[PDB]
């Protein structure tokens, strides 16, 4: 399924982003993510996106999982519509989300669809923040109990059946 | 990308539909079947306890000057509060520009939207749901029609590509 929107010229944005070796390094070897928020954000700001936010994401495989998987994307508005630059989405390509096979630059709706349709069993939710280090703190990679998590401010991309069973 | 939801046991619904030889035939040969499929699928869903059954008429437009848009039909029903779309002839588009549509679909409403949205980069896709199947077939017929004179009232947009936003003047 497609990775780059034609709502904006994502193809050309991606070309430009790859000329930043901090970014390109990850686009080629997407493992290990936060450090992208800044250069991606800066890029977007130069291209005229505004209301730039940092999206912290958790991916939960099971209720009893000890540390959820985190992930980050940057969101920005261009002519009234939200877009998500998630240039390291494809670190999930070989982790059960093979539909995430390259960097994403998508409308907000397309991005949600991309993740939703990549998996049936994983619980995926996010929060958008004004500050990237607040995002990294709230969606950190430390042990966390799903039963003790506040769903306040969490936006669900999926809700697997186990998770509704789990909530009770 | 998955074709059957795990929100309900779409795998078992699919298999039961495929147990009916008339429906099996149309799923194996889906081109042009979606209209005739509405009633039998609807009857199945009704029997399986879905309510508020509607008939979804769909246009897919390639460009503004296209003489006749491509049409399609699916059936919507509610099961324990949530809408599910049975679209068992979606794979008619597989070898026609929408290769991500590679089998029959029984999905949540939102899943069904994502499937279509992400299957094309630049087709305009929109639909309307009707209580009556023959009204749906009429509304979304395959007769000559100009995009420019379509009312957008009551259309629900799966896509709204850049070119269409422009076309809107």
Numbering used by the authors:
A (entry chain B): 145 to 176, 178 to 313
B (entry chain A): 145 to 313
From the manuscript:
SseI is secreted into host cells by Salmonella and contributes to the establishment of systemic infections. SseI (also called SrfH) is an SPI-2-translocated protein that has been directly linked to systemic infection. The C-terminal domain (∼140–322) of SseI contains its catalytic function and shows some sequence similarity (19% identity over a 88-amino-acid stretch) to Pasteurella multocida toxin (PMT or ToxA), which causes atrophic rhinitis in swine. Based on its structural matches, SseI is a member of a particular subgroup (clan CA) of the cysteine protease superfamily.
Crystals of reductively methylated SeMet-derivative and native forms of SseI (37–322) were grown as described and their structures were solved using SAD and molecular replacement, respectively. The native crystals diffracted to 2.05 Å resolution and belonged to a different space group (P212121) to the SeMet-derivative crystals (P41212). The native structure was solved using the SeMet-derivative structure as a starting model and showed two molecules of the protein per asymmetric unit. No density was observed for the first 12 and the last nine residues of each molecule. The dimer is linked by a disulfide bond between Cys258 of each chain on the opposite face of the molecule to the catalytic Cys176. The dimer is likely to be a crystal artifact since the C-terminal domain purifies as a monomer on size-exclusion chromatography. The SeMet protein was purified using 10 mM DTT instead of 2 mM DTT to prevent Se oxidation, which may explain why it did not crystallize as a disulfide-linked dimer under these reducing conditions. The chain backbone in the native structure did not show any large deviations from the SeMet-derivative structure, with r.m.s.d.s of 0.277 Å (chain A) and 0.250 Å (chain B) between the two models.
